[PDB]
């Protein structure tokens, strides 16, 4: 009997501002904000997601979870796209943008509760965003000069590797710095030409051992074995390397090339002809000076015997991506045909050999003095697959973060451990107090939204926020005998677990954040919050 | 008195249903009116989400169940094909007119009387529109007015931050295509392109055309200054023997020799191309050479071109070649043997842009391209769609303003002034009869919906703003002076639209008023609802 | 925010409930306004059918469930002790004003501003009423104006046919009961009688009093002229002890001896009574003699009086005795021992009325009765009740008009003129506030409910007759002469109330407006409903 009314478009799940849609969307986003809050910080806790393939994946990266989490509410997709943008443009801050957007939308609930309209809230958020972005430029303490030195690189490497397998930085930072130094070319008095390339660094893992057994190899390491009599090249420099696409077998002909067997003598002659053709093809390859052969397809037993007879090393690379990487390392070009390895298409690799790591043989194409390649590989070892995956993700993130040290103020360093957050909170509060009109409340709530970072750092470490946060605020909220603030203004959230109580200056650990990363994260989080708040009606359908 | 498989509305049920549907549609489109309005979120169910504010797009994409709402949306959609804007205004006017008509009908007023009153008020509003408009000058230095119009159009669709970027872009794009002459205006001369993995604020204006395909050789110059544009329809890919042949061999060396011998056909054409390049400004300073080469190019030919400091493209769309024929002035050469300098065009800086997923080429800075390109840049699909919609709306608004010099100040001044003029003149004249006063008052009150909705969206109280506007208008009338009084959605008090820079199109308002009156008359005259065909 | 096991209403629920109750009561009482209104049947569980049109009877004798409606009905009925009429007017005004206030609130107008506007409009309406009233002449010979007032007050309660009989009776009674002196008017001297024998059209005016208790004798006088009135307080009938007792005899001598004790006092009193009758009017021609004898009378003394041509009454009411003393001038004799001719009064025609179920005695035609009596006749309880209510309403209305010389022309002129004056004055002065104009317009529109309801009850369309009246009002205001314009509920066209003879009481209208404004202000200020006490 009870009729339905209020919907004139169609039969669907309708959300309207009259029914509190602005708060329903906020709660829907909170559904994942709660998950993302416990992920940020050095003491972040792991999450497990089961893939459709039956593989159990454990990680602390918010972006990885979002890519796998089943998200159907259209409002959350705004923050998902924000995280995707953070991952694409910046090398870090995937959790930061999510946390900031969630906190902004949460404080928007308080703003609405006071009777403020969404439009004025958005205007105040935009003004506070502009003020915060302008102020961020003044939060720089040090600057990376991009000298490619390991010690200088460690400054940025250490903070990035943190929050993933915390406590293992002593080895991960060294590995990342060594790889970056190996791949980084030598240059000076120029900032227009890019130098770092993330694609030039590859990460591999071998089961067994521990992280202490990891090492870095200058060059590209492959898990494929030669599967031939010759296991490595000689000590001569600049061995000619040939890449083939057609399988190493009897050479064919573009026109005709069809052979039919009917008689037994014909079959015997055909077998002898196949043997002779393989021998002749290998002889022709040798005559061109080819000393190493890369086969993207299968290789016959006769082909192996003949190529080993001429002292030519054969390495199988069936993976197209591995073939591309090898071609980039040595500069060789794949040959679609057999028997025509033109010198112009041949690469140069000084040393090619097979190495045993934990019982698994791997082949590395590397060099020392001549034809230096800017590619490096990081070898990880560990008895636990979950630890190996976590360390691989941490290394990947650390290597990627190096791309942010380029010309556009990439070396700027800001205080970490939330000290920058406290300073920005104070500045935004002052600006809101100065700002007239109702926008002051929006500015104050925007400032409050930045209190999450110390909150998350304290909570993830098992510390009570009610005792950590006020102490940090009191330490930052001090008056100096002068018009300019000075002294220890870099105090942040401590890892705790020792000492007695309170906060410490970050200079002991040298933890700093990137200006570009923080600015981009703030901008994207504010844009996502504005987009979410700008919607007062959502149309959803059964899925 | 009914038939199976059918349902009908009797007595005033049809009127009540139509009024309820109109009110529902108005409330759906009430919140998105004005720069202070909100955005609607649409989900198609396939994973694509659209965040749109334009009324036409919202009505077209959204599914409507109420037949009366469907009719209202379809009728209002005509604004897009006539003026390009005002759909939300039409919907709001229809909704308020139907509200007032239903209120009067509850008092016993026949619908036909209301329809006649609406027609009389429509005639009076047309007279007021004619008397109230402002004539725009034909000066070529009106760029400031065009900027104001573009800002007014954009502020309704953007977040007030991209306005600074889009206003100059739209103004320049519209002005370049339509010179300070009679001639004619065609928005097809302005190309719209979208790029991903870029910031929303990166949107810029390109004087000429942008080519999708880029170079495929590291040695080609990144930038070419004062380049001669060559368009070639002859393929430069590897060619085989003109007569029947093949590759029958025992070793690949014979095949390589045969391929080298056959390459002479392409080599001959490359020689002619290089000769043309050398003859025409081969070594002249501040000169370059660029070849389009619609057809494909063999890598060896690409290397040959690169070694001669020639920037050559390949595999370009025929539409791009046709556009280049005008943008650069060069001609497409069907046969290399007849190649001559007259085919070569001329263009300014030629720049190649490298993107992670693609590579673009710029052929802008032309003497008289008779066209321009706007590059919409964004990182998300919804952002790109919003930017494209805003750019198109601004282009259409500026084109309407240029073609039609009649301009009317906005900011709600027109609606309030029209309402006051009707309330005065119709009541003082009473040209049809007293019984039409109900419809006259209904129309006059309904015409005030737009300013009230704008004030409600801005967050201010409509009562106080309307009272202040009325007080200012009364003071102006008592002073015996001509003054335009509008609504300031940022301060909340009254303001002069002619000074702040808020303007509305004459055609938009005319068509919106006519459509709203027609829809209201058609719906109010519905006596009953009939169902058939089941 | 609620305690466990508690009931309360928040948000706009209180407004919805109040508006619904007010509209329901307004619709219930709408059809009872004007002479063309309808009649309602009431049954208070006893199964008796009662028909009436008086607002007080409808509100008080009908059960109301909604608490807001109960308060509205009580407030409207409270006016009966102040003016005696206007209950339906108060209810209709409250309902329409609340409807308009809710309509404005739906636009965002706060209730307090509406209340302030109502107060301002109330002050303006009081000023308009002061400037609009007409001073009635105090000449006692203005029987025409009194008849017009009585007809106007009566037509609302009767079927428009009994008016020709009842109006003159009520008018004459009210005119006569007022002495030819300043003094004051007192309707307590006007008695109303009900008889179930004849039809309502047979009602007549009685100049004096009517006595219900009388003697019985076949020779009792039927008509007596120029009769002297003697009031006696001593019993003239045989009396027995409190305990049952009697006289028993076995012979004629014992019978006579025992009956002597009973008849001694009766004979002693009769001796002096007959002596007095012989002394005065014993032989005088064209004279009569009537004796009241408040106490009882035995049949022997009744026969004795009859044989002497004396009209003897018995067991008269004390109130009737006092009214006779004030009317006939005769004094009450405590005991016949001091009987004297000075006790005798004087009266005109004295006659008895014989009915199937009872008998009555008339003592009318007195020199200066200083009192009046109205006899109501009918065949059914509901008809008698309706006639009594109409007679009382007419008496009160005429008495109020005589007391207060201020008279307001009716026919709907007052309300239309008040609304027009309010609108014009508030649009010109602009002295209250811009936003208060909302409440001012609400009050102005609400004050037009009464004429609209009157037109609707008559079957005519308000939209036409009210428009014609507005046009006539505009014409009269443009002219330099003073003219009153109203609505003719019988013809449907406009008419002048001062010429046709339709008038409204000044006090009734003033108090109705005040009460309606107060009730509306009180109700519109209710935000939440809280239940407590159990």
Curated annotation (Swiss-Prot), chain A:
Keywords: ATP-binding, Chaperone, Cytoplasm, Isopeptide bond, Nucleotide-binding, Phosphoprotein, Ubl conjugation
PROSITE patterns named in the record: TCP1_1 (PS00750), TCP1_2 (PS00751), TCP1_3 (PS00995)
Species of the source: Saccharomyces cerevisiae (strain ATCC 204508 / S288c)
Protein name (database record): T-complex protein 1 subunit theta
GO term, biological process aspect, one: protein folding
Modified residues (Phosphoserine): 499
Record's function text: Molecular chaperone; assists the folding of proteins upon ATP hydrolysis. Known to play a role, in vitro, in the folding of actin and tubulin. In yeast may play a role in mitotic spindle formation.
Presence of keyword ATP-binding: yes
Cross-link Glycyl lysine isopeptide (Lys-Gly) (interchain with G-Cter in ubiquitin) residue location(s): 9
Molecular function per GO: ATP binding; ATP hydrolysis activity; ATP-dependent protein folding chaperone; unfolded protein binding
UniProtKB/Swiss-Prot annotation, chains B, C:
Keywords noted in UniProt: Acetylation, ATP-binding, Chaperone, Cytoplasm, Nucleotide-binding, Phosphoprotein
Family annotation (SUPFAM superfamilies): GroEL apical domain-like, GroEL equatorial domain-like, GroEL-intermediate domain like
One Gene Ontology molecular-function label: unfolded protein binding
Subcellular location: Cytoplasm
Residues bearing the modification Phosphoserine: 245
GO cellular component, one term: chaperonin-containing T-complex
One Gene Ontology term from the biological process aspect of the record: chaperone mediated protein folding independent of cofactor
CDD domains named in the record: TCP1_zeta
Any Pfam family hit: Cpn60_TCP1
Family, as annotated: Belongs to the TCP-1 chaperonin family.
NCBIfam families the UniProt entry points to: chap_CCT_zeta
Function: Molecular chaperone; assists the folding of proteins upon ATP hydrolysis. Known to play a role, in vitro, in the folding of actin and tubulin. In yeast may play a role in mitotic spindle formation.
Subunit description: Heterooligomeric complex of about 850 to 900 kDa that forms two stacked rings, 12 to 16 nm in diameter.
Listed name of the protein: T-complex protein 1 subunit zeta
Organism: Saccharomyces cerevisiae (strain ATCC 204508 / S288c)
Source taxonomy: Eukaryota, Fungi, Dikarya, Ascomycota, Saccharomycotina
Gene: CCT6
């Amino acid at each position: 009997q009870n009729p339905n009314a209020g919907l004139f478009k169609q039969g669907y799940n309708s959300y309207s501002n009259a029914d509190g849609q602005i708060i329903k969307s906020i709660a829907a986003i909170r559904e994942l904000h709660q998950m993302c809050l416990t992920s940020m910080g050095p003491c972040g806790r792991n999450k497990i997601i089961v893939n459709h393939l039956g593989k159990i994946i454990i990680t602390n990266d918010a972006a990885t979870m979002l890519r796998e989490l089943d998200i159907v509410h259209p409002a959350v997709k705004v923050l998902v796209m924000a995280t995707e943008q953070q991952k694409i443009d910046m090398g870090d801050g995937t959790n930061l943008v999510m946390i900031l957007a969630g906190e902004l939308l949460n404080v928007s609930e308080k703003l609405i509760s006071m009777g403020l309209s969404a439009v004025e809230i958005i205007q105040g958020y935009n003004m506070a965003r502009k003020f915060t972005l302008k102020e961020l430029d003044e939060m720089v303490v040090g600057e990376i000069t991009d000298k490619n030195d390991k010690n200088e690189l460690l400054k940025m490497i250490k903070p990035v590797i943190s929050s993933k397998k915390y406590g293992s930085e002593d080895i991960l930072s060294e590995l990342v710095s060594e790889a970056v130094s190996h791949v980084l070319p030598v240059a000076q008095q120029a900032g227009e030409i890019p130098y770092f390339n993330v694609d030039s660094i590859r990460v591999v893992k071998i089961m067994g051992g521990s992280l202490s057994n990891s090492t870095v190899i200058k060059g590209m390491v492959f898990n494929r074995e030669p599967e031939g009599h010759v296991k490595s090249l000689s000590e001569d420099k600049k061995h000619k390397v040939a890449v083939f696409t057609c399988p190493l077998d009897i050479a064919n002909t573009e026109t005709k090339g069809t052979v039919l067997l009917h008689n037994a003598q014909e079959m015997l002659d055909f077998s002898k002809g196949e043997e002779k053709q393989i021998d002749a093809m290998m002889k022709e390859i040798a005559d061109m000076g080819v000393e190493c052969i890369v086969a993207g397809a299968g290789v016959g037993e006769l082909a192996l015997h003949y190529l080993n007879r001429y002292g030519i090393l054969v390495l199988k690379v069936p993976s197209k991506f591995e073939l591309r990487r090898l071609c980039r390392v040595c500069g060789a070009t794949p040959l679609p045909r057999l028997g025509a390895p033109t010198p112009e298409e041949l690469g140069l690799v000084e040393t090619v050999k097979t190495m045993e790591i934990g019982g698994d043989r791997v082949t590395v194409f590397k060099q020392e003095q001549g034809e230096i390649s800017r590619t490096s590989t990081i070898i990880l070892r560990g008895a636990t697959q979950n630890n190996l995956d976590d360390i691989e993700r941490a290394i990947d993130d650390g290597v990627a973060a190096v791309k942010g040290l380029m010309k556009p103020s990439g070396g700027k360093l800001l205080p970490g451990a939330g000290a920058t957050e406290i300073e920005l909170i104070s500045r935004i509060t002052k600006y809101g107090e100065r700002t007239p009109g109702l926008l002051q409340l929006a500015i104050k709530q925007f400032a409050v939204a930045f209190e999450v970072v110390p909150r998350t750092l304290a909570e993830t470490a098992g510390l009570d926020v009610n005792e950590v946060l006020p102490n940090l605020y009191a330490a930052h909220n001090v008056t100096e005998p002068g018009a300019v603030k000075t002294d220890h203004l870099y105090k942040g959230v401590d890892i705790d677990g020792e000492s007695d109580e309170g906060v410490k200056d970050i200079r002991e650990e040298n933890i700093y954040d990137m200006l570009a990363t923080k600015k981009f994260a703030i901008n994207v989080a504010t844009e996502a919050a504005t987009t979410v708040l700008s919607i007062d009606q959502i149309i959803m359908a059964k899925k | 008195l009914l038939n199976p498989k059918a349902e009908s509305l009797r007595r005033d049920a049809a009127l009540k249903v139509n009024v309820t549907s109109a009110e529902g549609l108005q409330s759906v489109l009430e919140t998105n009116l004005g720069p202070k309005g909100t955005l609607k979120m649409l989900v198609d169910g396939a994973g694509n989400i659209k965040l749109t504010k334009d009324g036409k797009v919202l009505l077209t994409e959204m599914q409507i169940q109420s037949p009366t709402a469907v009719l209202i949306a379809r009728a209002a959609a005509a604004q897009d094909e006539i003026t390009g804007d005002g759909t939300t205004t039409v919907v709001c006017l229809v909704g308020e007119l139907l509200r007032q008509a239903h209120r009067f009908i509850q008092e016993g007023v026949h619908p036909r009387i209301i329809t006649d009153g609406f027609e009389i008020a429509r005639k009076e509003s047309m007279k007021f529109l004619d008397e109230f408009k402002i004539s725009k000058t034909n000066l070529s230095n009106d760029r400031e007015f065009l900027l104001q119009v573009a800002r007014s159009s954009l502020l309704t669709k953007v977040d007030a931050d991209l306005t600074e970027v889009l206003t100059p872009i739209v103004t320049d794009a519209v002005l370049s295509v339509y010179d300070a002459q009679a001639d004619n205006l065609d928005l097809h001369m302005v190309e719209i392109m979208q790029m991903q993995h870029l910031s929303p604020k990166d949107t810029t204006f390109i004087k000429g055309l942008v080519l999708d395909h880029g170079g495929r050789h590291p040695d080609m110059p990144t930038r070419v200054k004062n380049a001669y544009v060559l368009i070639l329809n002859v393929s430069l890919e590897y060619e085989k023997t003109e007569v029947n042949s093949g590759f029958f061999y025992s070793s690949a060396d014979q095949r390589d020799k045969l391929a080298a011998s056959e390459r002479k056909f392409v080599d001959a054409k490359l020689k002619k191309i290089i000769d043309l390049k050398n003859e025409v400004c081969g070594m002249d300073p501040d000169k370059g050479f660029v070849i389009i080469n619609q057809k494909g190019i063999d890598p060896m030919s690409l290397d040959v071109f690169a070694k001669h400091n020639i920037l050559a493209l390949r595999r370009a769309k025929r539409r791009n070649m046709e556009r280049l024929q005008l943008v650069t002035g060069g001609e497409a050469q069907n046969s290399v043997e007849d190649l001559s300098p007259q085919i070569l065009g001329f263009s300014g800086l030629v720049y190649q842009e490298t993107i992670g997923e693609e590579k673009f080429t710029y052929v802008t800075e032309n003497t008289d391209p008779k066209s321009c390109t706007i590059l919409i840049k964004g990182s998300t699909h919804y952002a790109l769609a919003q930017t494209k919609d805003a750019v198109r709306d601004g282009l259409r608004a500026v084109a309407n303003v240029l073609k039609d010099k009649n301009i009317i100040p906005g900011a709600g001044a027109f609606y309030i002034a029209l309402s006051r003029y009707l309330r005065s003149a119709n009541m003082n004249k009473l040209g049809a009869k007293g019984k039409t006063k109900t419809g006259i008052e209904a129309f006059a009150e309904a015409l005030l919906v737009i300013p009230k909705t704008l004030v409600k969206n801005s967050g201010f109280d409509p009562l106080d703003v309307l009272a202040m506007v009325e007080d200012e208008l009364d003071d102006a009338q008592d002073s015996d002076e001509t003054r335009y009084v509008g609504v300031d959605l940022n301060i909340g008090d009254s303001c002069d639209p002619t000074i702040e820079g808020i303007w509305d199109s004459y055609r938009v308002l005319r068509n919106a008023i006519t459509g709203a009156t027609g829809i209201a008359s058609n719906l109010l005259l519905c006596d009953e609802l009939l169902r058939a065909g089941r």
